Design a protein around this ligand. Structure first.
Ligand SMILES: Cc1cc2nc3c(=O)[nH]c(=O)nc-3n(C[C@H](O)[C@H](O)[C@H](O)COP(=O)(O)OP(=O)(O)OC[C@H]3O[C@@H](n4cnc5c(N)ncnc54)[C@H](O)[C@@H]3O)c2cc1C
Ligand SMILES: Cc1cc2nc3c(=O)[nH]c(=O)nc-3n(C[C@H](O)[C@H](O)[C@H](O)COP(=O)(O)OP(=O)(O)OC[C@H]3O[C@@H](n4cnc5c(N)ncnc54)[C@H](O)[C@@H]3O)c2cc1C
Ligand SMILES: NC(=O)c1ccc[n+]([C@@H]2O[C@H](COP(=O)([O-])OP(=O)(O)OC[C@H]3O[C@@H](n4cnc5c(N)ncnc54)[C@H](OP(=O)(O)O)[C@@H]3O)[C@@H](O)[C@H]2O)c1
Ligand SMILES: NC(=O)c1ccc[n+]([C@@H]2O[C@H](COP(=O)([O-])OP(=O)(O)OC[C@H]3O[C@@H](n4cnc5c(N)ncnc54)[C@H](OP(=O)(O)O)[C@@H]3O)[C@@H](O)[C@H]2O)c1
Lengths: 446, 447
């Protein structure tokens, strides 16, 4: 109805938030651009759409989801609630604070099922190339539609990139991998923990993947777990059959050797070494290059590409906050696309981003980090009609979560926190984490 | 010479393409400028083994489907280069079914001698090829992973040598989303010892199934089941390996089959083939076909009929391999160089149709490899590729077929005669089943 045409790449949480932002503005009576969203999977959800598939999907594209069986929320759900679609509204009842994948998946779909935005999406279509033409001032987006096996392009006035940054593995090599006889994989290819039942598992890395894949491995009966770190130990007090050591240095037919001179028989090695920002459809003029951090550079307000401000990136930061961060972002992007918030000059954009980067470098403690992100989110929601929830109250919730993890890393998921949107407190779940062997939504909600 | 060629990939076909040009210039011709792009850090293609699975370190798809303990699948006598013999490379006779590392060494040998490595830009992935109608040139856009830059270059011709056995065809079966063992495609199979003392289901009834089964067996898998969609492999298997009708569904631990059987299974390996997948090509340049002896739209099986400045090498199914690619690369070379002019689109189409009509006739393995030999024969008669004896190579194939029928676990223990040198291969020092060391070093010593 407005003259322009927008392309949204990806229908993960960020892609869905972006459609939702437009749908919301129009429901309040605005005229909005034409929307096309492209998604390579057959259904929306992004990471949350679980697949048994590993490696390359059935059309030959990279498998996107890194999620595995038995995965549950990693932080209080109370911290990732939508300000415009509460947990109360979706579920009709109170539920525990750390829901399984399927439940959280259900929740986010619910919002966009209600919004009726599914119709903007062309599923099973992979983005191949985006180019900007200087003379028309438009982007040409080329895609492959895998349902018809045709490749075609279309012209757009703005492009919002919502393709995530936790799907292309960073996989470093260690000496002797070419002759190790057990399995080597990246966290990205981890599926069923029962595959590692009665086995000795090495996890390389000291971040969330290593904490969590370790825990699932443990909880489903891995015989022994070794996890090893490059910089500093995770530092949690692990179960009896799990130990932390200095980094792996080499491997041979059955054995792993470590930097402290230890050595051990190992059955499988899981690289929990993170991901890279990888945009294979973008040229150097549009393509973001960064490591995982709270403040990537060259994004104004963390979302506008400074070299071509008709291009936007959603959710490319590291994530303490997640779902409502993407909303705050998508709402911003929407508003600038729609002319409601004009942009400053390239010089001020750069100055502003530099200030944000300066402060990022200041940050030492987990507490400072999520607060920094809250400060960021706060800035965004103040500029748009996103409902402004209570950021400091969400920070306390993060703080409590931090503590519970320290107390006992195996039972942090058994606690409860209060919604910052509704005020409702979460009930205890009906089963302790360690004993809830059934990841299904059906079991979680009975 | 005025023009500029882009060669995509430095596997056996890419290397053959470089070698054809180098050869022509060694006999005194002026050749085009050459750029070859390879995404891996070394040449060899499938033969360059990687422990990596899924996506490689730059984020590109892992290319090699090869696994530890792999050896040649047919007589080496059948895949010898007519211009670089096994005798010349190795300085001695060797057995007929060499390991991966040994064949790898042999093909690199030819191009190390030719000095063509300097044309290649390694660690560079091809992203897009476009043809511009107004300049009549191709713009090839690539990412260099050493510098992390994306750039383009203009070319007059493009030869595509990126292979067709690297993007898995992976079908879904009911209940995969809840099975608790591993699911993988043959593409991701690396060490057989990962399946020691385990029960392994192999879905499929072709070469991957035969060979991944055999490796699994030979390295001590407890039990093997292999199931087929159309017809059984039909070989007489070991005692802990059986063939059944197709898998229908799966649950937490169990596999159920079409004949009503059911079994506890540890790992499922899909041995279901690959797809021709060219993610850098638009519909005007992109070949779409299933695995076969005669894909359609390739004139002489190499020239893209819709834009004859674009060429495809090694896109057929492979009885013959390495010297088929040479026959082709030499043909492509000669057309690109002006030595062989092309007919009209109409005759290209008519000729291709005739070849396809015959491909539909083929029933027996013997007819199939003979067809391919007829095809190869046609190509080498048009270029100065040395014409070896195709009928003699056909016999070798035929003997190989027999040995496989007699005993599927000892076909690799036989020996055949080179069709290039006449030399007969010696017996290997170790029976296949007992040769647990896949290394070049072990294969070439005398114990
Ligand atoms: C293993 C794991 C566990 C996590 N757990 C939690 C958690 O418990 N809590 C939490 O808050 N966050 C968690 N996260 C963070 C997660 O990043 C966010 O929750 C959320 O998934 C961000 O979604 P997104 O839309 O930005 O990207 P994604 O969820 O990755 O989705 C991006 C979309 O882009 C599509 N796409 C990509 N490339 C193309 C292409 N070339 N063409 C077409 N479409 C394309 C993908 O198919 C996908 O649908 C987890 C992440 C991982 C990897
Ligand atoms: C598991 C397996 C076992 C086999 N065993 C035998 C055997 O024993 N005997 C036999 O005769 N044949 C065998 N083959 C057949 C095999 O196809 C040929 O031997 C030979 O490897 C074909 O070489 P190629 O150059 O055509 O393709 P490939 O060997 O696949 O090489 C193609 C090259 O293209 C490069 N490439 C692809 N995409 C890009 C890109 N986008 N950008 C840059 N570079 C790219 C690749 O990295 C690779 O180097 C086997 C095949 C498989 C899968
Ligand atoms: C989800 O997922 C996100 C992170 O997922 P993630 O846990 O997979 O990755 P991540 O949070 O970005 O961390 C990657 C991890 O891999 C470790 N690492 C990287 N290279 C290594 C190497 N060569 N050897 C050993 N360890 C290495 C890093 O160790 P160091 O940084 O300490 O060296 C870090 O612990 C979280 O933000 C959450 O929101
Ligand atoms: C190398 O590698 C090449 C082939 O390698 P390859 O063995 O992996 O692939 P292939 O030779 O192309 O054969 C693919 C195999 O997968 C089987 N298959 C496909 N879909 C299936 C399904 N849904 N269920 C069960 N079986 C299925 C086919 O069975 P069917 O064709 O009989 O149905 C066939 O046996 C050889 O030519 C050699 O040169």
């Amino acid at each position: 109805s407005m003259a322009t045409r927008i392309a949204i790449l990806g229908a993960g949480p960020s892609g869905m938030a972006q459609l939702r932002a437009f749908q919301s503005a129009q429901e309040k009576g605005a005229e909005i651009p034409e929307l096309v969203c492209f998604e390579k999977q057959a259904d929306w959800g992004g990471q949350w759409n679980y697949t048994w598939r590993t490696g390359l999907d059935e059309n030959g594209e990279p498998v996107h989801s890194s999620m595995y069986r038995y995965l549950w929320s990693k932080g209080p759900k109370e911290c990732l609630e939508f300000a415009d679609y509460t947990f109360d509204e979706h579920f009709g009842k109170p539920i525990a604070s750390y829901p399984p994948r399927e439940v959280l998946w259900d929740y986010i779909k619910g919002r966009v099922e209600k919004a009726g935005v599914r119709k903007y999406i062309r599923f099973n279509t992979a983005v191949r190339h985006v180019e900007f033409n200087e003379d028309s001032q438009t982007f040409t987006v080329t895609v492959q539609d895998h349902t018809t096996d045709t490749i075609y392009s279309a012209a757009f006035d703005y492009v919002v990139c919502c393709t995530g940054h936790f799907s292309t593995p960073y996989v470093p090599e260690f000496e002797g991998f070419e002759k190790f006889g057990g399995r080597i994989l990246h966290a990205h290819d981890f599926r069923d923990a029962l595959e590692f039942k009665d086995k000795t598992v090495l996890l390389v890395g000291s971040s969330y993947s290593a904490e969590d894949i370790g825990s699932q491995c443990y909880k489903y009966g891995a015989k022994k777990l070794i996890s090893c770190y490059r910089t500093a130990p995770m530092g949690y007090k692990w179960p009896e059959n799990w130990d932390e050591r200095p980094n792996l240095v080499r491997v041979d037919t059955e054995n792993a050797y470590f930097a402290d001179g230890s050595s051990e028989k190992v059955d499988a090695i899981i690289l929990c070494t993170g991901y890279i920002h990888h945009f294979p459809f973008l040229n150097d003029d549009l393509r973001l290059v960064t490591n995982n951090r709270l403040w990537p550079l060259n994004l104004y307000k963390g979302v506008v590409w400074e070299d071509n401000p008709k291009f936007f990136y959603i959710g490319m930061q590291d994530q303490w906050y997640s779902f409502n961060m993407f909303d705050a972002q998508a709402w911003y992007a929407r508003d600038v696309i729609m002319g409601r918030l004009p942009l400053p000059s390239k010089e001020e954009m750069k100055a502003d981003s530099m200030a944000w980067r300066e402060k990022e470098l200041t940050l030492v403690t987990a507490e400072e980090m999520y607060t920094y992100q809250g400060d960021y989110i706060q800035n965004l929601i103040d500029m748009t009609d996103y409902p402004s929830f209570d950021i400091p109250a969400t920070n306390k919730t993060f703080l409590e979560w931090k503590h519970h993890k320290k107390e006992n890393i195996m039972t942090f998921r058994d606690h409860s926190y209060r919604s910052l949107m509704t005020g409702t407190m979460a009930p205890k779940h009906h089963t302790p984490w360690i004993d809830a062997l059934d990841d299904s939504l059906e079991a979680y909600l009975s």
